[PDB]
Design an enzyme around this catalytic site. Structure first.
Site, PDB file in Angstrom:
ATOM      1  N   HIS A  73       0.840  -1.204   0.000  1.00  0.00           N
ATOM      2  CA  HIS A  73       0.000   0.000   0.000  1.00  0.00           C
ATOM      3  C   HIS A  73       0.875   1.254   0.000  1.00  0.00           C
ATOM      4  O   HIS A  73       0.878   2.055   0.936  1.00  0.00           O
ATOM      5  CB  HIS A  73      -0.961  -0.006   1.185  1.00  0.00           C
ATOM      6  CG  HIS A  73      -1.950  -1.133   1.166  1.00  0.00           C
ATOM      7  ND1 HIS A  73      -1.776  -2.291   1.892  1.00  0.00           N
ATOM      8  CD2 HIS A  73      -3.126  -1.276   0.507  1.00  0.00           C
ATOM      9  CE1 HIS A  73      -2.794  -3.102   1.671  1.00  0.00           C
ATOM     10  NE2 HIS A  73      -3.626  -2.510   0.830  1.00  0.00           N
ATOM     11  N   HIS A  77       1.316   1.355  -5.822  1.00  0.00           N
ATOM     12  CA  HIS A  77      -0.096   0.959  -5.837  1.00  0.00           C
ATOM     13  C   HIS A  77      -1.008   2.128  -6.217  1.00  0.00           C
ATOM     14  O   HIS A  77      -1.915   1.975  -7.045  1.00  0.00           O
ATOM     15  CB  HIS A  77      -0.475   0.405  -4.458  1.00  0.00           C
ATOM     16  CG  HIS A  77      -1.935   0.125  -4.287  1.00  0.00           C
ATOM     17  ND1 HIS A  77      -2.607  -0.822  -5.038  1.00  0.00           N
ATOM     18  CD2 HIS A  77      -2.856   0.654  -3.438  1.00  0.00           C
ATOM     19  CE1 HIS A  77      -3.876  -0.865  -4.656  1.00  0.00           C
ATOM     20  NE2 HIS A  77      -4.051   0.015  -3.683  1.00  0.00           N
ATOM     21  N   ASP A 114      -5.352   5.546  -0.769  1.00  0.00           N
ATOM     22  CA  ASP A 114      -4.657   4.794   0.284  1.00  0.00           C
ATOM     23  C   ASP A 114      -3.560   5.613   0.963  1.00  0.00           C
ATOM     24  O   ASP A 114      -2.688   5.031   1.618  1.00  0.00           O
ATOM     25  CB  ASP A 114      -4.004   3.520  -0.256  1.00  0.00           C
ATOM     26  CG  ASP A 114      -4.943   2.328  -0.280  1.00  0.00           C
ATOM     27  OD1 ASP A 114      -5.905   2.270   0.526  1.00  0.00           O
ATOM     28  OD2 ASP A 114      -4.697   1.441  -1.128  1.00  0.00           O
ATOM     29  N   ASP A 231      -8.811  -0.947  -7.912  1.00  0.00           N
ATOM     30  CA  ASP A 231      -8.134  -1.371  -6.685  1.00  0.00           C
ATOM     31  C   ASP A 231      -7.894  -2.885  -6.653  1.00  0.00           C
ATOM     32  O   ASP A 231      -6.886  -3.341  -6.103  1.00  0.00           O
ATOM     33  CB  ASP A 231      -8.991  -0.939  -5.499  1.00  0.00           C
ATOM     34  CG  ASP A 231      -8.205  -0.814  -4.214  1.00  0.00           C
ATOM     35  OD1 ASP A 231      -6.962  -0.639  -4.253  1.00  0.00           O
ATOM     36  OD2 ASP A 231      -8.849  -0.876  -3.151  1.00  0.00           O
ATOM     37  N   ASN A 234      -5.058  -6.116  -9.866  1.00  0.00           N
ATOM     38  CA  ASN A 234      -3.786  -6.829 -10.007  1.00  0.00           C
ATOM     39  C   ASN A 234      -3.941  -8.160 -10.728  1.00  0.00           C
ATOM     40  O   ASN A 234      -3.126  -8.447 -11.618  1.00  0.00           O
ATOM     41  CB  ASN A 234      -3.096  -7.091  -8.653  1.00  0.00           C
ATOM     42  CG  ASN A 234      -2.684  -5.835  -7.919  1.00  0.00           C
ATOM     43  OD1 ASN A 234      -2.430  -5.882  -6.712  1.00  0.00           O
ATOM     44  ND2 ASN A 234      -2.651  -4.697  -8.615  1.00  0.00           N
ATOM     45  N   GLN A 282      -4.446 -16.896  -3.637  1.00  0.00           N
ATOM     46  CA  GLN A 282      -4.718 -16.089  -4.819  1.00  0.00           C
ATOM     47  C   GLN A 282      -5.890 -16.672  -5.594  1.00  0.00           C
ATOM     48  O   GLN A 282      -6.785 -15.931  -6.032  1.00  0.00           O
ATOM     49  CB  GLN A 282      -3.465 -15.971  -5.695  1.00  0.00           C
ATOM     50  CG  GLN A 282      -2.405 -15.049  -5.121  1.00  0.00           C
ATOM     51  CD  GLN A 282      -2.932 -13.635  -4.973  1.00  0.00           C
ATOM     52  OE1 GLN A 282      -3.531 -13.103  -5.910  1.00  0.00           O
ATOM     53  NE2 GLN A 282      -2.747 -13.029  -3.794  1.00  0.00           N
ATOM     54  N   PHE A 285      -8.965 -15.954  -3.597  1.00  0.00           N
ATOM     55  CA  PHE A 285      -9.353 -14.551  -3.722  1.00  0.00           C
ATOM     56  C   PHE A 285      -9.973 -14.275  -5.085  1.00  0.00           C
ATOM     57  O   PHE A 285     -10.979 -13.569  -5.180  1.00  0.00           O
ATOM     58  CB  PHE A 285      -8.143 -13.645  -3.488  1.00  0.00           C
ATOM     59  CG  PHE A 285      -8.494 -12.192  -3.272  1.00  0.00           C
ATOM     60  CD1 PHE A 285      -9.390 -11.821  -2.274  1.00  0.00           C
ATOM     61  CD2 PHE A 285      -7.917 -11.199  -4.057  1.00  0.00           C
ATOM     62  CE1 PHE A 285      -9.714 -10.483  -2.064  1.00  0.00           C
ATOM     63  CE2 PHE A 285      -8.222  -9.866  -3.843  1.00  0.00           C
ATOM     64  CZ  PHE A 285      -9.128  -9.507  -2.849  1.00  0.00           C
TER      65      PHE A 285
HETATM   66  C1  LIG Z   1     -10.521 -11.076   4.657  1.00  0.00           C
HETATM   67  O1  LIG Z   1     -10.889 -10.914   3.283  1.00  0.00           O
HETATM   68  C2  LIG Z   1      -9.845 -11.024   2.385  1.00  0.00           C
HETATM   69  C3  LIG Z   1      -9.422 -12.294   1.980  1.00  0.00           C
HETATM   70  O2  LIG Z   1     -10.051 -13.415   2.415  1.00  0.00           O
HETATM   71  C4  LIG Z   1      -8.360 -12.435   1.106  1.00  0.00           C
HETATM   72  C5  LIG Z   1      -7.726 -11.305   0.640  1.00  0.00           C
HETATM   73  O3  LIG Z   1      -6.701 -11.546  -0.266  1.00  0.00           O
HETATM   74  C6  LIG Z   1      -6.031 -10.489  -0.857  1.00  0.00           C
HETATM   75  C7  LIG Z   1      -5.144 -10.829  -1.865  1.00  0.00           C
HETATM   76  C8  LIG Z   1      -4.500  -9.813  -2.551  1.00  0.00           C
HETATM   77  C9  LIG Z   1      -4.711  -8.456  -2.242  1.00  0.00           C
HETATM   78  C10 LIG Z   1      -5.631  -8.152  -1.229  1.00  0.00           C
HETATM   79  O4  LIG Z   1      -5.957  -6.832  -0.967  1.00  0.00           O
HETATM   80  C11 LIG Z   1      -6.870  -6.165  -1.867  1.00  0.00           C
HETATM   81  C12 LIG Z   1      -6.425  -4.745  -1.966  1.00  0.00           C
HETATM   82  C13 LIG Z   1      -6.536  -3.949  -0.926  1.00  0.00           C
HETATM   83  C14 LIG Z   1      -6.094  -2.540  -0.927  1.00  0.00           C
HETATM   84  O5  LIG Z   1      -5.532  -1.959  -1.855  1.00  0.00           O
HETATM   85  O6  LIG Z   1      -6.339  -1.983   0.218  1.00  0.00           O
HETATM   86  C15 LIG Z   1      -6.305  -9.155  -0.515  1.00  0.00           C
HETATM   87  C16 LIG Z   1      -7.350  -8.856   0.490  1.00  0.00           C
HETATM   88  O7  LIG Z   1      -7.539  -7.708   0.888  1.00  0.00           O
HETATM   89  C17 LIG Z   1      -8.104 -10.005   1.036  1.00  0.00           C
HETATM   90  C18 LIG Z   1      -9.241  -9.866   1.896  1.00  0.00           C
HETATM   91  C19 LIG Z   1      -9.849  -8.530   2.271  1.00  0.00           C
HETATM   92  C20 LIG Z   1      -9.416  -8.046   3.631  1.00  0.00           C
HETATM   93  C21 LIG Z   1     -10.185  -7.591   4.618  1.00  0.00           C
HETATM   94  C22 LIG Z   1      -9.627  -7.133   5.936  1.00  0.00           C
HETATM   95  C23 LIG Z   1     -11.682  -7.509   4.518  1.00  0.00           C
HETATM   96  C24 LIG Z   1      -4.038  -7.461  -3.044  1.00  0.00           C
HETATM   97  C25 LIG Z   1      -3.384  -7.820  -4.140  1.00  0.00           C
HETATM   98  C26 LIG Z   1      -3.427  -9.225  -4.658  1.00  0.00           C
HETATM   99  C27 LIG Z   1      -2.100  -9.613  -5.287  1.00  0.00           C
HETATM  100  C28 LIG Z   1      -4.588  -9.415  -5.622  1.00  0.00           C
HETATM  101  O8  LIG Z   1      -3.650 -10.176  -3.569  1.00  0.00           O
HETATM  102 MG   LIG Z   2      -7.465   0.960   0.823  1.00  0.00          MG
HETATM  103 ZN   LIG Z   3      -5.871   0.237  -2.513  1.00  0.00          ZN
END
Ligand SMILES: COc1c(O)cc2oc3cc4c(c(OC/C=C/C(=O)O)c3c(=O)c2c1CC=C(C)C)C=CC(C)(C)O4
Ligand SMILES: [Mg+2]
Ligand SMILES: [Zn+2]
Length: 322
Positions: A73, A77, A114, A231, A234, A282, A285
């Site tokens: 962050h 980003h 952010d 956001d 990626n 990944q 997600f």
């Molecule tokens: C718990 O729920 C989850 C969950 O279960 C798995 C997750 O997994 C990720 C995986 C991410 C990224 C992730 O971040 C997205 C970008 C956020 C930003 O720019 O602030 C996450 C998760 O955030 C994430 C969350 C969400 C989190 C909360 C606290 C509700 C960012 C980049 C890539 C490479 C796509 O990988």
């Molecule tokens: Mg944010």
């Molecule tokens: Zn962000």
């Protein structure tokens, strides 16, 4: 070196711009140079009488308040979300849908969305009784803070890029920017996606073939989901980009999990570096969050987003294969 950078900045309208090279070529100023390029490209300086020197001064001050020691962050980003929002705004199905002021709001919101992120989650800040959680009463703690910092910096010397907007222009943009950034709180994803699904199912299109948005509620909801897609974009990017984003989010997650363990707390999902499964997460997600959203967006602008959705599906397959 400036000629190479200028060459790479020719791709600012392309999905999968190489934002990391631009960061290096710009001396860790990806947010400033990409924002400046985009404003030039969209003629925003002339439209809103933004003095060039004011723009650079604000952009540099804003970039400075992203943390360089936070692996995900950070200012890279932010530049990436700006640029992705910039491309999403240019999609054929949205041509002439949003005013110049709404385009400004979405791009400005993406740039500040952010700022001053400390690299821990809302839930961590709540559970550790942080000052930020205390100031914002545990509700969209980070998101409220990014907005307050992003707007406050407009008051520094020669930083008010909005100085020649009318009072009603400022008021409308501030409200739109707030609505957009508060929608990036991930706790709101499901309600945001459910709302976008409803809109696609009742989607209306003009005689020209372009999305028809009657009212603030529909327009702001599309702008909120657009920045939210940017956001979470990626995994729709070319794999060499996506993999570097994965490396960075896992470093930041793992370091939160160390803090959590150092303090007796249970480790948050994906933050335990002795029990991680990077590739599995990944895929999880993408399947449960990223693909449902991007598929819904693709239906809204069908077929403009088919290559982005195809890249996502290939990248999901590749991570699965590992
Ligand atoms: C718990 O729920 C989850 C969950 O279960 C798995 C997750 O997994 C990720 C995986 C991410 C990224 C992730 O971040 C997205 C970008 C956020 C930003 O720019 O602030 C996450 C998760 O955030 C994430 C969350 C969400 C989190 C909360 C606290 C509700 C960012 C980049 C890539 C490479 C796509 O990988
Ligand atoms: Mg944010
Ligand atoms: Zn962000």
């Amino acid at each position: 070196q400036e000629d190479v950078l200028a060459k790479e900045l020719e791709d600012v309208n392309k999905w999968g711009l190489h934002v990391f090279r631009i960061a290096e070529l710009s001396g860790n100023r990806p947010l400033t140079v990409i924002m400046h390029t985009i404003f030039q490209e969209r003629d925003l300086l002339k439209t809103f009488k933004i003095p060039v020197d004011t723009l650079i001064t604000y952009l540099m001050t804003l970039e400075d308040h992203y943390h360089a020691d936070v692996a995900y962050h950070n200012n890279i980003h932010a530049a990436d979300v700006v640029q992705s929002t910039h491309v999403l705004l240019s999609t054929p199905a949205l041509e002439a849908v949003f005013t110049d002021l709404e385009i400004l709001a979405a791009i400005f919101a993406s740039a500040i969305h952010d700022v001053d992120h400390p690299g821990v989650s809302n839930q961590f800040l709540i559970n550790t009784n942080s000052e930020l959680a205390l100031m914002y009463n545990d509700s969209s703690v980070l998101e409220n803070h990014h907005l307050a910092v992003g707007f406050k910096l407009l008051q520094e010397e020669n930083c008010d890029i909005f100085q020649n907007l009318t009072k009603k222009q400022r008021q409308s943009l501030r409200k739109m920017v707030i609505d957009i950034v508060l929608a990036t709180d991930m706790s709101k994803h499901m309600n945001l996606l459910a709302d976008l699904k409803t809109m696609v199912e009742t989607k209306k299109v003009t005689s020209s073939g372009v999305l028809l948005l009657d009212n603030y509620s529909d327009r702001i909801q599309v702008l909120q989901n657009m920045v939210h897609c940017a956001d979470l974009s990626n995994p729709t990017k070319p794999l060499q980009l996506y993999r570097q984003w994965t490396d960075r989010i896992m470093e930041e997650f793992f370091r939160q999990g160390d803090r959590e363990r150092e303090r007796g707390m249970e480790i948050s999902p994906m933050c335990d570096k002795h029990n991680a499964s990077v590739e599995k997460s990944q895929v999880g997600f993408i399947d449960y969050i990223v693909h449902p959203l991007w598929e819904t967006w693709a239906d809204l602008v069908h077929p403009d987003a088919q290559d982005i959705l195809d890249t996502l599906e290939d990248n999901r397959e590749w991570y699965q294969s590992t």
